[PDB]
Design a protein around this nucleic acid. Structure first.
Length: 77
RNA sequence: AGUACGGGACCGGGAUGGACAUACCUCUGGUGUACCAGUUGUCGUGCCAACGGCAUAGCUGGGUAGCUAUGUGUGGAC
């Protein structure tokens, strides 16, 4: 899902290192297909770009393959 | 955008603090018994003075150099 949501603070006697709260400038947000010859390297990059946003249990928001489980909880550590 | 989530998130990134460590005396202070000034009692040079001796440095108000913190800098990042 292409949205860009990432943390919260609003805005993008001293601030925590100048400015804060920066998400990501949506450029693609469409079904991406990696084209390679080495399965090993292909898998690494594929999972490397799949770690950007781990499939959340809320509505499966984030790069993933197909697996997904509905949920809405994070109150106990 | 205070949008998700249903009040309040992890994300790169100038500087303000607390405690502690270290260096120094320009500044604010402290001390400064061979520096300057004011003043009480008594003794000594015929009288009075000036000055000297003793009284915690006689007492009181300031204070140079030096040594100092509560004073002035820097650090702990990457």
């Amino acid at each position: 899902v292409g949205v860009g949501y990432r943390a919260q603070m609003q805005g993008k006697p001293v601030e925590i290192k100048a400015e804060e709260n920066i998400t990501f400038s949506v450029e693609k947000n469409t079904v991406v297909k990696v084209e390679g010859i080495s399965k090993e390297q292909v898998g690494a990059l594929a999972s490397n770009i799949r770690s950007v946003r781990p499939p959340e249990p809320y509505k499966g928001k984030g790069i993933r393959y197909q697996g997904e489980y509905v949920r809405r909880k994070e109150g106990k550590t």
